[PDB]
Design a protein around this nucleic acid. Structure first.
Lengths: 314, 452, 297, 516
RNA sequence: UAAUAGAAUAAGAUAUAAAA
RNA sequence: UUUUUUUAAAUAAUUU
């Protein structure tokens, strides 16, 4: 068609249509024969497959990049001048136009620069592909958590695979990146070692969420969903809280128990999750897996513009 | 790039924009400019109004939205220092804020509109054209400012202070705003006539297009434009041929001596026709009403080899034009239906309805396009007129679609506009077809309104 | 140097000028277009500003508002142009828009019975020369002399009074200096009298005197740049030959209709000299007007 | 290396777990800027936390410059920081001191706001009497720095300042004079009276007072020349010992005032060039320009000034290459070494020069003989072809004329220049001649281009002289124009200035006479 | 405890409508 | 071929 002379350089209405990656954070993606620099050591892979989690030895982002990403997260929750492309989001805590002490966002890779770029970050996608047995890895979705200062709540015990029951096979991983320095007094991730292999790769019953209650009970509700043997393994290996720097990344199994603490510092705390999924993955029902997305039928392979292939071992 | 101050960054950003919007769209220059502008900040340094305006303009042109920092800092500066934005950097700020749609952008645009309204009497040749084009980019309805600017343009053009490019810019700017003033366009036409040989074909075609678009209904100047264009046919490009086809269909007057030569030149360059040119030509022929099968066969044949090049707009226009004239091309229709099924998410509010109705009017039903368009109708139901809603409902009834998740939005839209729905006589027959399929069970209130 | 002009108002152009002579409005518009184009084609004028039309024809006389003497922009008394005050405010808005002075000097207006007009003063070399006619009184002479006349070995400014008769037009219309040493005067009684008085007041003065034909309006931008562009009327060819013979550049201009209404070339343009304020020790760049690298080639 | 207590305090500050007031962050930043033993500037996770502590604190406690210093020390590390804007006092918070502090905050931290200026001025007027003499001068200075257009209030302040002439000192008088001269719309009566007051107390002045007075007189203009007279007489007894910057200001004022008593000019220039070696780059440039404008560059003058400027010639600012390049022209003195070094420096910075500066440099080097055999011609040709989109009519004419005079041959560049010049019409003959000169180098152009060129040149033939007529005819014959209206117009002018044809007449003219 | 300034410059199609 | 203007304007009506 004919694009007006002052609209030639614009981007699509949503960044999903943009094939490839923009050069915003780390420039252009490396060449085909340049992807071996970002490989990770086998011991990290063994640690993940043993504990159900591991920390990447090197921070994945420079401090300027973390500053830019924190600015994007701040602008995603303006609440006075709402973010453009807000209608391109799977779910938002500002749908009520009031917000609260916890701001959670999903599918923001179609909304802002940099967040879309972070998906194709080589250092994390190569590691996730190595965890997923060297196959094509497709983004499942992102997530952003922002907790206010002195009142931020905590999300209790949960399993990631409990939210993805519409997807047939167990082939996933999660990468969590800290956009601000975190510790047990501000949203630290607390995980149980060796919990991804408890119920023969099964899902534990959901926990009871009662808001407006102290963090101690919220984190102690764990003794309600487990059995005696899981209790003994808990006693041997109590849940461990992990400290993260301003750029450090953490790989988590989909099936390991996971929680985050409250925020009792004097500033808001930010973190970002991205879930990565393997090639051989099918659907179970007929329809869209996420709101306003391409619909699948029976056991159809999951592809499309909504689940782009981020890395290819060929 | 670190040793460059903000002033040099602004100059190089302007250079990159000028190189990209004119000499090709090299996907390298755009991405380099995006990367450079993503890491700049107007903070802690004293900057002129022009440099800040240039940075804001070149940032917004390259996709940067109203959530970016650079944009926020430039907008805050433009809000705080208002008297520093003289009449030289007003067009840059207005053009940058045209596409941004927020509170601050609206306030800045209004303030600049009032400033240009007050100083409308002291502008010169460059400023009037630049300001009027910049205000035509944004959608604003400040009639008094337009009147003052038109008066100043007439006063300047009486003495002869406009060139061919200025005339084209002024004509397009005043036609885009739907400001119908006979004296201003007469003055512009007379200035071009005085210019004589200084207007070439490239500076003549947009003049005719804009003069047709404004719709003055003056048959005195249309004939003169046709006679002037008759000598320049042999030098025209294919895009120019399509542009004059559309323009002289917009005029509405029949000039056979011109249409014949235009048809011959269009046939000569049939190998240079893209899908856009074919769609434009067929739409122009549909509008003017002439029926010329000889050119139509060649247009249809050339459209068959560029199927993959078709956009949503081109598919819609081509299919509607082909269906109006009763031309049958089963291969072209099938390929267009498949392609429309592939890109069903690119149809706008009215293109979808036009495509569906054009496909349903002729006896051509294909499930691939039918399912895609029926599913896509949900997101464009809310932007439809009463007649367009009636056409969409009839086309959907012809496709035999019964999914309630599709039919609830269109029935809601047609119930909200029932008066204009049932007061259009030309569609009355269509109404009796629609309820012949769904029956009184489907949406009883609509049936009760129909019986009355 | 910025030159200001005003477009004619076609609808309200007078049918028959004073004296009952006839005028053609289309030709008047055409001649003003030719004048504007000729002014723009001048190399010395940095910009030509065109003000919006005003209902009265007298608004075409924009030169009557004020006068430029050295670095002083003196505003003429508003004693006979009461209906033209609003036009003067509108002209001052135009002057301010182009980066000129914020406001005019009001020295003459405060003085009582100080009748004067822009046009009886000639920016001669080494001072100004004023004419003592009916349109200006002796109070204006005394006030100008007290304001601008200074006698010094070097800081010298000379004001000259030149007596003229009642029927004589304003001095700038017929007696004026051009080039650097050339005095252009109408081969008329008043022109010869003014030339003689200027020669006498300032004795031992050497400058060629050129006599044009009567009725040949002229305009010369007199300044250090030594521009030789001298606009003259089209009809008179002998004045044109005389100006060319002195080493100048006559630029013919059709000036029939404006002449028929009583307006001359000098009364139709407002020339001003602006500068840019230089904060801190500063020396703004200036455009060149000569040749470069003379010694090499 | 951080020991246990040091590491724990670092961690506590990193986690935003400590409440910091503005004073404490200021003290820590001062310690970091003074001493670097603990590596405060080398820990991004620590200065980021300090910045987060600074944002959420009350910055109104500290002085404006302390906030500016914290912002600067965070900017130096790599954190984008800006101190918060101060709110206008309301209700009983009204006082002269707070109304001065608002302007001071807007001044130091570089946050100019016209709305807040207008609000503050609308609220300080009633209490103008209560103000102390020093606060009046402070307000005048602050309003002069903020480029406020409200000249009426500045005039009122200046009048109240004059009413206390006895109280003020020489420094305050000079500051008031310069701050009044900087305001554009100030009435000339108050300016005359202030210069009258400056005229007395003349012997009390110090070098700073002299600099302030000379700056004010340079800003004002020739209309106050008389006052400047008493300045040059006053300094005639101290000229043998003055600061170099003072003599540079004297030269600038001499050039601006168009002074005509030449003996003072000669004495002051002779005193200046003795100590000209102490001048900075900018002051050296302006001494050179002012001396050139006064027609005082003799042989020794130019030799000494060139020897002084060749030191900075290695790293000249781009804005200073063109002026000295112009000064090297129009003088009959040898300046080969300065020319060569300046051309090399110009070549070095060819990717940062703006369009106007590139055009000016090409114009100045257009007729230079040694500038043809250099890489600068090709580099500048490519740069000009790239920058043709950003060039106005003056820049286009300058660059094209300079390139044509230099022998640069590139048909595509000249065709693009002709198109860009056809975008906006040529107002003058001097703006159109370079296009013809460039297009005549190759000798061919598309017929539409030559037709448009003929249409443009035809009206302009009415006022050009004989030499311009000959040059235009030569260029048109080289390009090959067939249009008759042109030749007819050129013919008529020729006749008017030359009557009828004669055997003596030049052949070309006689041909031009035939209207070919 | 903290205060110094320079530049003048123009790109161009959104699928509508009754009388010297 | 040419045709245009320069107020602080404040009185509609409703249960939306």
């Amino acid at each position: 068609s004919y694009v007006l002379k002052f609209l030639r350089g614009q981007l699509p209405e949503d960044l999903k249509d943009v094939n490839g990656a923009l050069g915003c954070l780390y420039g252009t993606l490396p060449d085909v024969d340049e992807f071996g620099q970002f490989v990770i050591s086998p011991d990290v892979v063994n640690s993940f497959h043993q504990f159900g989690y591991v920390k990447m030895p090197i921070p994945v982002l420079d401090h300027q990049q973390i500053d830019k990403l924190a600015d994007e997260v701040n602008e995603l929750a303006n609440n006075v001048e709402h973010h453009p492309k807000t209608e391109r989001l799977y779910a938002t805590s500002l749908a009520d136009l009031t917000g609260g002490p916890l701001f959670f966002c999903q599918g923001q890779w179609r909304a802002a620069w940099g967040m879309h770029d972070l998906i194709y970050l080589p250092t994390i996608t190569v590691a996730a592909s190595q965890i997923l047995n060297n196959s094509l890895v497709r983004l499942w979705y992102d997530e952003v958590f922002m907790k206010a200062a002195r009142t931020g709540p905590c999300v209790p015990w949960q399993q990631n695979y409990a939210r993805w029951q519409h997807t047939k096979p167990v082939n996933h991983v999660t990468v969590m990146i800290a956009l601000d320095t975190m510790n047990k007094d501000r949203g630290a991730p607390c995980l149980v070692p060796g919990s991804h292999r408890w119920r023969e790769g099964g899902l534990l019953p959901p926990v009871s969420y009662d808001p407006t209650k102290d963090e101690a009970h919220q984190l102690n509700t764990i003794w309600e969903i487990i059995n005696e043997e899981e209790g003994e393994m808990l006693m041997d290996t109590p849940p461990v809280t992990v400290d993260l720097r301003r750029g450090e990344a953490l790989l988590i199994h989909p099936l390991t128990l996971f929680a985050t603490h409250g925020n009792r510092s004097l500033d808001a705390v930010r973190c970002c999750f991205i879930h990565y999924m393997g090639e051989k993955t099918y659907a179970v029902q007929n329809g869209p897996l996420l709101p306003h997305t391409t619909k699948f039928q029976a056991d159809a392979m999951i592809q499309g513009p909504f689940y782009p292939v981020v890395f290819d071992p060929a | 790039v670190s040793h460059l101050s903000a002033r040099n960054i602004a100059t190089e950003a302007l250079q990159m924009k000028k190189l990209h919007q004119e000499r090709g769209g090299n996907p390298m220059l755009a991405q380099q400019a995006r990367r450079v502008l993503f890491a700049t900040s107007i903070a802690g340094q004293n900057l002129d109004a022009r440099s800040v305006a240039l940075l804001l303009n070149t940032a917004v042109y390259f996709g940067m939205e109203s959530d970016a920092k650079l944009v926020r800092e430039c907008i805050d500066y433009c809000l705080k220092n208002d008297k520093l934005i003289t009449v030289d950097v007003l067009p840059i700020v207005v053009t940058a804020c045209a596409t941004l749609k927020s509170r601050d952008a609206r306030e800045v645009i209004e303030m600049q509109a009032q400033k240009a309204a007050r100083n409308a009497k002291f502008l010169d040749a460059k400023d009037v054209t630049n300001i009027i084009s910049a205000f035509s980019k944004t959608g604003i309805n400040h009639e008094k400012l337009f009147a003052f600017l038109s008066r100043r343009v007439q006063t300047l053009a009486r003495v002869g202070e406009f060139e061919a490019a200025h005339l084209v810019i002024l004509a397009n700017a005043f036609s885009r705003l739907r400001y119908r003033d006979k004296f201003l366009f007469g003055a512009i036409a007379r200035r071009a006539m005085s210019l004589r040989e200084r207007v070439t074909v490239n500076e003549l075609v947009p003049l005719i297009v804009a003069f047709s678009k404004i719709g003055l209904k003056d048959p005195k100047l249309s004939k003169r434009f046709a006679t002037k264009a008759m000598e320049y046919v042999d030098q025209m490009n294919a895009e120019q041929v399509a542009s004059m086809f559309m323009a002289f269909a917009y005029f509405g007057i029949r000039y056979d001596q011109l249409f014949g030569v235009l048809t011959n030149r269009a046939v000569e360059l049939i190998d240079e026709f893209n899908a856009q040119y074919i769609s434009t030509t067929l739409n122009a022929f549909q509008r003017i009403g002439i029926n010329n099968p000889e050119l139509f066969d060649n247009l249809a044949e050339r459209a068959l080899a560029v199927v993959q090049d078709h956009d949503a707009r081109d598919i819609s226009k081509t299919v509607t034009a082909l269906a109006h004239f009763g031309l049958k091309d089963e291969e072209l229709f099938k390929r267009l239906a498949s392609h429309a099924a592939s890109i069903a998410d690119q149809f706008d509010a009215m293109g979808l309805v036009n495509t569906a109705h054009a496909f349903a009017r002729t006896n051509f039903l294909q499930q691939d396009m039918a399912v895609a368009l029926s599913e896509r109708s949900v997101y464009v139901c809310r932007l439809l007129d009463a007649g367009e809603t009636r056409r969409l409902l009839w086309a959907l009834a012809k496709f035999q679609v019964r999914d309630p998740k599709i039919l609830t939005p269109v029935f809601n839209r047609c119930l909200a506009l029932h008066y204009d729905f049932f007061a259009d006589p030309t569609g009355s027959e269509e109404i009796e077809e629609i309820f012949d399929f769904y029956g009184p069970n489907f949406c009883p209130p609509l049936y009760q309104l129909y019986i009355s | 140097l910025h030159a200001f002009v005003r477009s004619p108002h076609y609808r309200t152009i007078p049918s028959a000028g004073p004296n009952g002579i006839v005028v053609n409005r289309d030709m008047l518009v055409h001649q003003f277009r030719d004048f504007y184009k000729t002014l723009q084609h001048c190399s010395l004028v940095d910009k030509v500003h065109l003000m919006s039309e005003r209902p009265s024809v007298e608004a075409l006389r924009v030169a009557d508002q004020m006068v430029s003497i050295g670095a002083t922009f003196l505003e003429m008394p508003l004693t006979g142009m009461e209906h033209r005050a609003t036009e003067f405010m509108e002209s001052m808005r135009y002057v301010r828009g182009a980066g000129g002075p914020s406001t005019l000097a009001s020295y003459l207006q405060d003085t009582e019975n100080c009748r004067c007009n822009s046009g009886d003063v000639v920016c001669l070399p080494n001072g100004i020369a004023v004419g003592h006619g009916p349109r200006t009184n002796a109070v204006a002479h005394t006030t100008l002399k007290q304001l601008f006349e200074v006698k010094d070995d070097q800081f010298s400014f000379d004001v000259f009074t030149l007596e003229q008769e009642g029927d004589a037009p304003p001095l700038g219309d017929y007696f004026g200096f051009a080039g650097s040493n050339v005095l252009l005067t109408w081969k008329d009684e008043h022109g010869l009298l003014a030339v003689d008085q200027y020669q006498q007041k300032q004795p031992h003065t050497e400058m060629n005197v050129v006599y044009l034909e009567p009725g040949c309006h002229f305009l010369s931008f007199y300044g250090v740049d030594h521009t030789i562009d001298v606009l003259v009327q089209k009809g008179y060819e002998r004045s044109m030959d005389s100006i060319a013979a002195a080493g100048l550049n006559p630029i013919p201009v059709q000036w029939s209709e404006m002449d028929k209404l009583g307006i001359s070339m000098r009364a139709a343009v407002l020339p001003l000299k602006f500068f840019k304020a230089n904060v801190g020790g500063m020396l703004s760049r200036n455009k060149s007007r000569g040749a470069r690298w003379q010694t090499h080639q | 290396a951080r020991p246990s207590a040091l590491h724990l305090i670092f961690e506590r500050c990193k986690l935003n777990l400590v409440e910091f007031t503005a004073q404490d962050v200021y003290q820590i930043c001062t310690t970091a800027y003074n001493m670097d033993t603990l590596g405060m500037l080398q820990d991004p996770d620590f200065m980021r936390g300090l910045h987060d502590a600074f944002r959420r604190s009350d910055q109104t406690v500290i002085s404006p410059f302390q906030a500016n210093l914290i912002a600067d020390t965070f900017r130096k590390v790599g954190i984008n920081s800006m101190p918060k804007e101060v709110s206008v006092p309301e209700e009983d918070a009204i006082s002269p001191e707070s109304l001065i502090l608002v302007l001071r905050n807007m001044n130091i931290t570089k946050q100019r706001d016209e709305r807040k200026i207008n609000e503050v001025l609308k609220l300080m007027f009633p209490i103008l009497d209560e103000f102390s003499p020093t606060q009046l001068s402070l307000t005048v200075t602050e309003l002069a720095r903020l480029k406020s257009t409200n000249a009426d209030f500045v005039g009122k302040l200046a009048k109240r300042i004059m009413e206390y002439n006895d109280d003020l000192s020489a420094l305050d008088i000079s500051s008031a004079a310069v701050s009044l001269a900087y305001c554009p719309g100030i009435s000339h009566n108050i300016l005359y009276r202030m210069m009258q007051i400056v005229e007395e107390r003349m012997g009390e002045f110090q070098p700073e007072d002299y600099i302030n007075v000379l700056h004010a007189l340079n800003t004002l203009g020739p209309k106050f020349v008389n006052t400047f007279r008493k300045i040059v007489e006053c300094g005639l007894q101290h000229v043998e010992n003055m600061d170099a910057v003072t003599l540079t200001n004297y030269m600038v004022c001499f050039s601006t005032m168009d002074y005509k008593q030449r003996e003072h000019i000669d004495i002051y220039a002779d005193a200046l060039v003795e100590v000209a070696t102490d001048l900075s780059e900018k002051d050296l440039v302006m001494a050179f320009i002012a001396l050139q404008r006064l027609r005082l560059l003799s042989d020794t003058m130019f030799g000494t000034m060139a020897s002084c400027v060749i030191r900075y010639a290695a790293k000249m600012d781009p804005r200073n290459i063109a002026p000295i390049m112009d000064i090297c022209s129009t003088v009959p003195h040898a300046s080969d070494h300065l020319m060569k070094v300046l051309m090399d420096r110009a070549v070095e910075c060819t990717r940062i020069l703006t369009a106007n500066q590139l055009g000016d440099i090409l114009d100045i080097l257009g007729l230079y003989p040694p500038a043809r055999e250099h890489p600068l011609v090709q580099l500048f040709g490519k740069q000009a072809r790239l920058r043709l989109d950003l060039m106005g009519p003056d820049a286009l004419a300058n660059a094209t004329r300079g390139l044509a005079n230099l022998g640069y041959a590139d048909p595509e560049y000249y065709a693009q220049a002709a198109e860009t010049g056809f975008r906006y019409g040529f107002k003058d003959w001097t703006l159109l001649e370079p296009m013809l000169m460039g297009l005549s180098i190759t000798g061919q152009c598309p017929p539409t281009m030559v037709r448009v060129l003929g249409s443009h040149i035809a009206p302009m033939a009415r006022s050009m002289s004989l030499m311009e007529i000959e040059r235009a005819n030569r260029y048109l014959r080289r390009l090959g124009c067939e249009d008759d209206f042109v030749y007819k117009a050129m013919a008529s002018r020729v006749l008017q200035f030359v009557k009828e044809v004669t055997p003596e007449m030049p052949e070309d003219l006689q041909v031009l006479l035939q209207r070919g």
